[PDB]
Amino acid sequence: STAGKVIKCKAAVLWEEKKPFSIEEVEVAPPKAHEVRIKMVATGICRSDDHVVSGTLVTPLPVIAGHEAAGIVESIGEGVTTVRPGDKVIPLATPQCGKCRVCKHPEGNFCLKNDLSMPRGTMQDGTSRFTCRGKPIHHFLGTSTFSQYTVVDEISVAKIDAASPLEKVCLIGCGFSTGYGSAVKVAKVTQGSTCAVFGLGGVGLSVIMGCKAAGAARIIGVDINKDKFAKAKEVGATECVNPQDYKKPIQEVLTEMSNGGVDFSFEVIGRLDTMVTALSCCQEAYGVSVIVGVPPDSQNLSMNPMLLLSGRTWKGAIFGGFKSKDSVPKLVADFMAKKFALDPLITHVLPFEKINEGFDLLRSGESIRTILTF
């Protein structure tokens, strides 16, 4: 009874940086050709959503943020072939158009249809499906999941198993897949290796899960919040270090601990200094360091290229290197077959209406992932 009609529903609108979200009514247009309107069931609070609030991640405001989520298709536009009304789906913050040079490449996943490099805050057609107080509101990464309903381009949604528990598998839409793939796909962690993981939030814990799945012998968690260490050990860290406890820079500490440098290191925070420290602590001739964290907008790091000339490899990735539409259904199937766990990442559950409390929990250091239910 809503197909083809505007839907009025609640969403969390961000009108200004550094302010609480405003939970209020929005109007959601029906889907145009090759678009899908989704009734949201659950969405996680990822640090990247907070980066929009703080100005770390710049995208046009006002905006409906949220990108790690799962829901049920309410209606489809003309020409949609990959999902149908009633299907369970995960929106894809990195799309998979299937047609660009990146989608066609065996390794690449950062589809050229993304809205990250040159943010417009729109659908693929350059327009918005959201109105609030009569004003157009921007989308975020082609997802915008902090709303009871959203509209996404078909290349930004994947159909998943009809029996999936949406309050858990929403994490496959960003944080779990990112960390897990960063270890198993991007770094390609090897059996018996030593790994160092900087940042023990939801994404860093998922990196640990992937390093353990790959058979690493040592997994050193690094965080300035020692309250993060117990869960890190539960999911596979063999030891944890707090840089604030040491008189020496932690790259020196980690080099000593690993008898000359780690095999694989991961920056899962989003600071320029820890990106350079993480590179430095891998072994100078054969180490690999992967940047996962988001840097503050437009800022450059400084580093000595002799760190690379000796033989290190430095890389980064979005979404764990996974081609998003191909990979998300398979990761859900693997979760349903118990191949990895999501419960360790979920520390808090709240209704959507308590979104601001959910962001308070993240900012205070108390949560890993808070899941919001609609």
Added chain:
Amino acid sequence: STAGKVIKCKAAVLWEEKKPFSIEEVEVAPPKAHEVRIKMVATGICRSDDHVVSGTLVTPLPVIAGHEAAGIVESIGEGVTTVRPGDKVIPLATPQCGKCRVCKHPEGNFCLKNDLSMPRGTMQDGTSRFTCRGKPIHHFLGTSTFSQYTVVDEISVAKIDAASPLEKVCLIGCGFSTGYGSAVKVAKVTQGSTCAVFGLGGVGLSVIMGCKAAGAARIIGVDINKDKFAKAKEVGATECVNPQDYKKPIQEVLTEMSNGGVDFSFEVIGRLDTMVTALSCCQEAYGVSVIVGVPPDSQNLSMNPMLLLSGRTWKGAIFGGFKSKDSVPKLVADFMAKKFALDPLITHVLPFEKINEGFDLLRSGESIRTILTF
């Protein structure tokens, strides 16, 4: 004759930075345990030797530089098992001890016995075998080939084919192997790919050779000296560009030419700005950039880590990633089997006494490799 005795011979001593080499008599001590004394036959002029003169590369002075060479063993110290008097040999500016964690790793080659990371300018035992006018003179990279005789540690020398032409295969001791391996081993250039090579000297031409051997479809040479372009095309470049001819930054030019970025780029100059430009010109989701050039001492580059977060891989390497003692004899055997050519790199051949003239040729832009003959 000479075995077990001090040898007085001619060498090129660098007494201080930014001065001509001084060609004069030096005394070369006999080899101690596990050392090898070599009569030099030919040595190439690599830009890294010039970096010692200019202060770009810091190593203790006064010094006998030179590291790209070939000669004949004159005598061996106690315990040497891998070469014998009369053998043709290439000194190894990166050693291969066979016992450190890097030598044991399948990928690594930057053996921990190297004299690059913390230059001492000595033999492995911390002492020098050279005296000149009664003063001790430093070694360079455990090689020191600008002398009629040198003494090296066993781990810094490889025995090669007795029929090898030393006036050509000296280049396998540094510049050829570095550039070729940077393409075929470090980057692992793929068939049909597009490559960009910054710097068209001896090392960058060897990168082009390797890209062509790997089957690249397009190889774009980049140099500010257009006189380098004809030879670059002879060895495989499909086009060449001079940044000075363009109003736009060359990274933008190369991105446009390659319809969104190259597959592989190589910095083969030694400038911070070209290291960042070369990274930027590879495709943002799956491109690979390899640093080969030597940065000026103690200087840091500045770069935006979003270049990596999208999916690029940045790496560097010494000596093309080759494990030096294993690889040098095989590369000579490959040369003798006609698997690659060295003549395109050799533009001038001069007697050793004309070393300063050979450096003037390099500095003026007029040579690729000058081979000095003893």
